[PDB]
Amino acid sequence: MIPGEYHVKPGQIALNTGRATCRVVVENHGDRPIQVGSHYHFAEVNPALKFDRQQAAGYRLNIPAGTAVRFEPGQKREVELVAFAGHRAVFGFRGEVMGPL
Amino acid sequence: MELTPREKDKLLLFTAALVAERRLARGLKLNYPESVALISAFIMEGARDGKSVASLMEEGRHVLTREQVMEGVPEMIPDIQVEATFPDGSKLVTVHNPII
Amino acid sequence: MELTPREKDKLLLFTAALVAERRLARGLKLNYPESVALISAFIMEGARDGKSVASLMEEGRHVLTREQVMEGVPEMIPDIQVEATFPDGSKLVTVHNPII
Amino acid sequence: SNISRQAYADMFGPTVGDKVRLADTELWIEVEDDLTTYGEEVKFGGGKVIRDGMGQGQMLAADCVDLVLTNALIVDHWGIVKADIGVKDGRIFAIGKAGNPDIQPNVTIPIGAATEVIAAEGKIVTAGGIDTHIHWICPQQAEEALVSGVTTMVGGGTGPAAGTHATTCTPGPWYISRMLQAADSLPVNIGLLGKGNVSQPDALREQVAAGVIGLKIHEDWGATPAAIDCALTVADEMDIQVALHSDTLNESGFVEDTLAAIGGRTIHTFHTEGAGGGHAPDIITACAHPNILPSSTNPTLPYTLNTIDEHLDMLMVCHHLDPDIAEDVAFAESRIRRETIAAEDVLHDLGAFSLTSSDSQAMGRVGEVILRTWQVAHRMKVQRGALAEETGDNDNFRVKRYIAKYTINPALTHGIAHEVGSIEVGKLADLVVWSPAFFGVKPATVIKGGMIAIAPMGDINASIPTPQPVHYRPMFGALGSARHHCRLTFLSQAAAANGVAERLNLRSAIAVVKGCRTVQKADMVHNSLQPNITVDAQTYEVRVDGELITSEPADVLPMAQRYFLF
Amino acid sequence: SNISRQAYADMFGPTVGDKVRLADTELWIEVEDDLTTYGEEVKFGGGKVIRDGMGQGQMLAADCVDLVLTNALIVDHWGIVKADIGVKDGRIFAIGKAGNPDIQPNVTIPIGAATEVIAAEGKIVTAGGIDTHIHWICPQQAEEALVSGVTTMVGGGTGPAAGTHATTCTPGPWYISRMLQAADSLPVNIGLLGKGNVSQPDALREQVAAGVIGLKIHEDWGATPAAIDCALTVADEMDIQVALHSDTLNESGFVEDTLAAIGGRTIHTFHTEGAGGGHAPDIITACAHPNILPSSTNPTLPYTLNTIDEHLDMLMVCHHLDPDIAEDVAFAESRIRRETIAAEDVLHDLGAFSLTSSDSQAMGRVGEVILRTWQVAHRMKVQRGALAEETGDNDNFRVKRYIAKYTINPALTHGIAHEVGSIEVGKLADLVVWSPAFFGVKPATVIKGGMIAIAPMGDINASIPTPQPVHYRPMFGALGSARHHCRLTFLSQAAAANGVAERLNLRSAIAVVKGCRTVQKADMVHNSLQPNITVDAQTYEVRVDGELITSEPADVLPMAQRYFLF
Amino acid sequence: SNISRQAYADMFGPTVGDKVRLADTELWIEVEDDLTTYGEEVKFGGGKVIRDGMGQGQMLAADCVDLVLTNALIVDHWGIVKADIGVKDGRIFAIGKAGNPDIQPNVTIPIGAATEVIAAEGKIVTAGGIDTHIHWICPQQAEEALVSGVTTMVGGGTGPAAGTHATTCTPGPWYISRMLQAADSLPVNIGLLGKGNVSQPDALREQVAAGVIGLKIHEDWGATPAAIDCALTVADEMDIQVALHSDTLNESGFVEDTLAAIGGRTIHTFHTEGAGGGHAPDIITACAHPNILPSSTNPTLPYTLNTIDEHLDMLMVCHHLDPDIAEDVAFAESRIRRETIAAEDVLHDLGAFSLTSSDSQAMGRVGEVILRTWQVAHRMKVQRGALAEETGDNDNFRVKRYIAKYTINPALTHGIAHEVGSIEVGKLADLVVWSPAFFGVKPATVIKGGMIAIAPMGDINASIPTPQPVHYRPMFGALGSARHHCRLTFLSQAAAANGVAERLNLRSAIAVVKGCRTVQKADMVHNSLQPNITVDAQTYEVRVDGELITSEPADVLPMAQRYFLF
Ligand code: NI
Ligand code: NI
Ligand code: NI
Ligand code: NI
Ligand code: NI
Ligand code: NI
């Protein structure tokens, strides 16, 4: 007997189903580490990350909400991205969009 | 003594540990508040002795075992945290999984 | 420990009984607040041990005798009442004429 | 992208089909539904979701909530569901999916710059409890009840005076006015009960016009058919509730005479089992009637090995009976009965008793209404198994039936369900956050009207709020003018119309009671049973349809020695 | 129908001719009169008298009392009587026989639906004490005094500042205004004293117009003939009282010069014995004069084996004298004298000293005014036997003489006897309920303006209010707006006329002082003696009509180790 | 007439050329000047100077001070001087020579009947501290900070909610209004910070108009260049301060990108060293810029043997990292660095870091801002010797540089230096009295707006205020309406203009912030250094002009085990 214990149903949960996805190769060209959150607008990440910024427009990382991907200096990796939904209006970040798309 | 509110608050923790210490001596299996108070007061006295934070983080895991507490108590306590005045001022001691 | 106000209030009662216990050990004749605290704390520990309400109602009458208290104290205490967490939850223990 | 169900539950709390044990009891709840979109859960923290342009939007304060409780597991009379809860202007705004409509789908709770966050993942959220049997013996009862998860207290009294030690009555306009003024200082919602024992209606109308939301008829002030008739006539005119503690002595009549004096009018019967007071030995039969809303007081809940012992010696102190007099022992064997105490637990499980309450410091424990309600549910699961209404491999229906006893049903009984009593849109945001291991025992956060009012808090000088000693301390929702904005004083319709709040210079928000006369047993949520109940005058055995109703006493209970220092 | 006197006393408390011992002292009171009709006593409880149509009537709130204290044994300056006490609108309504005029005879206190009950059978009820020597060093002194049975506190100060540590002075309009604002938070009635030491009358009129009810002349601010003359001139114009702590140093003159500066005008001499301050060694001779109202401070009361030891080492800390300097030891043997300390107890017993007071945390104990007054009465009974005024086999007259010292006489001295100071019709209902075994030590209930303000209270979560730990806790009469309605702030006539209460936004009830200039020694109830007293300048021996006045020091006292934990 | 310098210092406190050790540290202050006339020092007590016609004059209240602190040793940014301090209408009136102009020469502080006295001979008097990094997690933090000597608290929060546990943000008009109402109950001056993380200016203007005096940009709400730009634009329009906790993750850019987004506008960088948060690993380089006002939070102050251990295991609890994951340990070695922690102490000693603050219960200790500031000064004296600015054989300049860090510099940074922050004529009288042996650890008296608000106080029932137990207890300056008159709630100019105080019915005195946008590094008193600082991205070594900046960790500190019970 464990007070407040869970009895979790075995299995897996599929995340962000029915949404457009794409893969991009990213390389950290900076000399300091960069970590990117699940919901950050990927096209507006730190300029030291080198990748196809046009392909990432309107996309975020396809990872569990609240998690992150770390890029140590020099690190190259392929990441999977998922399209933003709702109104698809981007405001904030580096101030590159500030409106619909 | 010019006791500040934090010093008076720690008097409450010391008193709760005296209750726990007397129950442990009678051979009772300790409950949740008794176990937390007992391990917490041990850490405060270790700080008063001048033990280091790294030594108490380890020593605090050997105050109570699973056989000296009620069923479910180790799982109700994932960690214990307490601050005390060390020779080099207030420091936080975090003891991970103290009851095994 | 997440102490509730009732738990903190019982810490006050436990502390007053420590004062009384140390005076009794020196051979003093106990006064009114000391006698009440001493018998009350005995009952709380009996509840923690898992003794029944009916057993403590009787055992609480043999903690102190007329020869261990000041003149007039037995008559100032017609009964002692205290509640504690028994294995089956909070219960009230009433001890009639505890000092004889 | 996929995640295992175990890693998912550790990050966001359980989802559909997962089960949780309530504290150290044998009760298990199963998540019935989840209002999220998997992958779009909002989480607050360093590098997490609730950030500018991400899970937090660009809207002005008018277009977003003041507070969001993220990933909450709601336990309420209507369902056991996983959802985000939005609070705006101190009231429940929505139960649904929070976030930013600019980038996220299906957002019904918008998060902006004006939004505070409470992280509820892995926690259970319930409505604040409602105790309708308070004796105002001391103000310290308010903090004790609040710490236990009770946010509304209905009762009567003037302090530690003989009248209040015995009855929930605030007698007369002067004491009513003084207690309404005192209520502004307390961090719970309050409604007062006047002295209902009088045979002249004007002496009652005067108390209602002064501010009481109900009248208590108590045998210590004479619970005769004429006083009962008079109180109900005024109650019907003024839309207030009547609470009854009947004639234990059978001085003026038997239970059938009290029931005839009531004449089918709406009434709340306090401590219906009878130990707390009432016609000896058959007050319990009132739960058969459609106009009776029956409650239990808590020392008889559940039936345990020490119950009788502490109850035979409780009556000997309160009424000063002494075991030497045979007629006083015959009186002791009259209010205290093993048969009605054992039957009461079963009648709660069947839904024939609809409310639980304390009877604070007058044969009742103010901090134990919730705790004892859950101990009864546990003891009933163990002895009786699953309810007939139960679906699935869980105790969801039993949980919904029992939570209604201290939340929605007291609110409906006292005419305050339009303000409090459940987690529903438009109601005051009185919410309680529990860790599952401490469910029903020690809450993690008590929210009053949208502000945290009390919570466990560690060392004030520490580098974080978690270091020892952790004990309950009042928060900003319990201070001065913030407290006044976050609590309600309930008034009768006549007192509100007459400008009592302005005359007394009451500083808290005011609410008015309504619908006290039209509520009936059939309206009690999941607790509307009208059984054909009889009590044997000789043996005191309780029968329902000729079948004996009994239960066995517990020797050990959950929610007890594992949690409390004393 | 008959009942034995022993069974009667156990049910209703003592009656005419019965005697009660006060706590563990040798003082016995005898019930002088009983206002009941035997058989018609009102008793509250299950199946008792106070019930609808029985001991409780049908009258509206306007025709009955708000509160009744049933079967009280009253101890006051005018009598030791058994009676019911009625309270209405926060004031004493009647002392007499309570009940229902419909069925009971000789009812002068009607009980209705609007009536609360305090069961006083077997208890002693007195007026709340009045301490007129308060140093406002900290606000915590208010609760300590209230717990001891003191409901009114007159003094001066701004907090723990050097001026206040030494003197009862609230200096100037800004501090007076701030302390009047702070007083609304305290559960006692308050009046403030200004700094009276100035030779320009306008600097005094300014303080009176700001709100002080008196002026303290203290030697630490210079107690010279010019400052004394100036303060008394203003006092005569503004109807306020002057309190004096005279020139111990004999710097400006001897006691005869201070007395000549006074010029027959009304004045209150603080710590008249002199240890607390005043002309060394003969300030005690002021009790011979008709215009002097003399009080004692409490550390010298009664004379005990440890008095001198704690008093020789008290002066060495307060004034930082050090035993190494001979001129400082010569000063120590000047304020601290065995002869005047032993004589003071006798002068209290003869009625030559009329008031007792604390001198709170400035050579005085705030919670011990009442306790020490009774210890003196006990030590005097033991050493001197019965007073010349005593009739019967009891100490009734000695009790009336001593109770007047901390109730009516301080009230008369400070011009507040029209509001407080005794149990009389029309006065504020500040009442203290005592169990006889704890009389003068630990009260059962403290009522402020008709509401219970503080009382011993047991476990908040318990099934009754009596389980351990029982300790004093504030009640509803001490909370927010209820407290404001139940306490008084006393103002001078000039401050009330000038709208000081409206300007400062004072929330409590206001009362105005009057009759400070016309009160004289002959007006001191049972304490009007003007003896022909002399002090020998060499030996310090006190003589009255050439007869040596002395007493022996106690080694053990009642109201001490039997009751206190530390 | 002559007196030896030793006897003089024992009676009046030290004079010119005398030296005092600060608590148990190695810091010595030397009295630079003395404003008295030898022989004319004012002393209060039996037979002393402050008496009618002597050191006390005949003036009306308008012509004298309300309070005098006699023979104070002032320690402030402008000097270490011996003087009397006069207070009138709750503000500092004069620093000079007190007494009576009728008989004494060079009197600039007149003493009359309306004057209270605080005896400061042998004590050090400083301004009340100002903490600008408060997380309003619980109201109990106010008393803890006040007891430590902090009288003003600037921060944000709503209670123990996830948003507040992590950030100093009071989000939105509803929470801002509720927290401003709650602030009236607290005995410290308060100003609130809103949530600055939004890319729409109207959502920020709304919070400023509701009452915040600043906006906190926190990485947990997204510290992106667009949110930073938006917050600074609004700050420039509304004359409020911006506080920054930068993007530790380097998600949106590196430190140079944050600095470019700032664009030379005025900003307060919180925990500039970086452990508390910010661009990893080089946020520390911001102290080189003229528009940056850099503060430290206190757990990294000073660098000690246990610092890292408690800081590596602090981040693992706050962010739930777990030592098993390599990427979380790589993150742990990113915010926690020995090199920047050791360099921070030196940067404080050189004046490159200008403020100290707590980060209360969110990687900071509310009662230790002052204590830790002095521990750094001690550790720096011991390791580095005398500062280049130091004259004489004393640490006067180092003391002036460090005291400015928690008094004047936070006040200048937040636009409140016109009201508080130093002992200067016209400022609020928030003063702290210290005995030299307890300097910086345990004060003797805390004065708020001219009234004592908290002080150590002994046994309430004792004959004097010094008997045990002595512990901190609230005084009259902390009660009800007196508290409202003695504290300030700071508002933005827009909130004051819009009648927010009248709308919310705020009862305390109101002050308005101004001059937040024009303050720069050059304005930081004795802490205006702009060093050429670099951080190595690989090794994290801090260099100034190519020279390595480091210090050694302490094993034992002063102001620690000698003073505290736990
Ligand atoms: Ni009842
Ligand atoms: Ni009841
Ligand atoms: Ni005096
Ligand atoms: Ni005095
Ligand atoms: Ni930060
Ligand atoms: Ni912070």
UniProtKB/Swiss-Prot annotation, chain A:
It catalyses: urea + 2 H2O + H(+) = hydrogencarbonate + 2 NH4(+). The apoenzyme can be activated in vitro in the presence of nickel ions and carbon dioxide, which promotes carboxylation of 'Lys-217' of the UreC (alpha) subunit. Pfam families: Urease_beta (PF00699). One of its GO terms (molecular function) is urease activity. The keyword Hydrolase applies. Its EC number is 3.5.1.5. Keywords: Cytoplasm, Hydrolase. Gene3D superfamilies: Urease, beta subunit (2.10.150.10). One of its GO terms (biological process) is urea catabolic process. Disulfide bonds: none annotated. GO terms for cellular component: urease complex. It is found in: Cytoplasm. It is an enzyme of class 3 (hydrolase). Pathway: Nitrogen metabolism; urea degradation; CO(2) and NH(3) from urea (urease route): step 1/1. Its main location: cytoplasm. Optimum pH is 7.75. NCBIfam families: PRK13203.1 (NF009682), urease_beta (TIGR00192). Heterotrimer of UreA (gamma), UreB (beta) and UreC (alpha) subunits. Three heterotrimers associate to form the active enzyme. The apoenzyme interacts with an accessory complex composed of UreD, UreF and UreG, which is required for the assembly of the nickel containing metallocenter of UreC. The UreE protein may also play a direct role as a metallochaperone in nickel transfer to the urease apoprotein. Belongs to the urease beta subunit family. This is Urease subunit beta. It comes from Klebsiella aerogenes. The lineage of its organism: Bacteria, Pseudomonadati, Pseudomonadota, Gammaproteobacteria, Enterobacterales.
Swiss-Prot record, chains B, C:
One of its GO terms (molecular function) is nickel cation binding. It comes from the Bacteria. It is found in: Cytoplasm. SUPFAM superfamilies: Urease, gamma-subunit (SSF54111). Its main location: cytoplasm. It catalyses: urea + 2 H2O + H(+) = hydrogencarbonate + 2 NH4(+). The apoenzyme can be activated in vitro in the presence of nickel ions and carbon dioxide, which promotes carbamylation of 'Lys-217' of the UreC (alpha) subunit. Keywords: Cytoplasm, Hydrolase. Pathway: Nitrogen metabolism; urea degradation; CO(2) and NH(3) from urea (urease route): step 1/1. Pfam families: Urease_gamma. Optimum pH is 7.75. Its EC number is 3.5.1.5. One of its GO terms (cellular component) is cytoplasm. One of its GO terms (biological process) is urea catabolic process. Heterotrimer of UreA (gamma), UreB (beta) and UreC (alpha) subunits. Three heterotrimers associate to form the active enzyme. The apoenzyme interacts with an accessory complex composed of UreD, UreF and UreG, which is required for the assembly of the nickel containing metallocenter of UreC. The UreE protein may also play a direct role as a metallochaperone in nickel transfer to the urease apoprotein. Belongs to the urease gamma subunit family. This is Urease subunit gamma. It comes from Klebsiella aerogenes.
Swiss-Prot record, chains D, E, F:
Binds 2 nickel ions per subunit. Carboxylation allows a single lysine to coordinate two nickel ions. Ni(2+) 2 binds at residues 216, 245, 271. The apoenzyme can be activated in vitro in the presence of nickel ions and carbon dioxide, which promotes carboxylation of Lys-216. Ni(2+) 1 binds at residues 133, 135, 216, 359. Residues 128-566 form the Urease domain. Pathway: Nitrogen metabolism; urea degradation; CO(2) and NH(3) from urea (urease route): step 1/1. Changing residue 319 to N/Q: Reduces activity 100000-fold, but increases KM only 3-fold. Substrate binds at residue 218. GO terms for cellular component: cytoplasm. It catalyses: urea + 2 H2O + H(+) = hydrogencarbonate + 2 NH4(+). One of its GO terms (molecular function) is urease activity. PANTHER family: UREASE. HAMAP family: Urease_alpha. This is Urease subunit alpha. The lineage of its organism: Bacteria, Pseudomonadati, Pseudomonadota, Gammaproteobacteria, Enterobacterales.
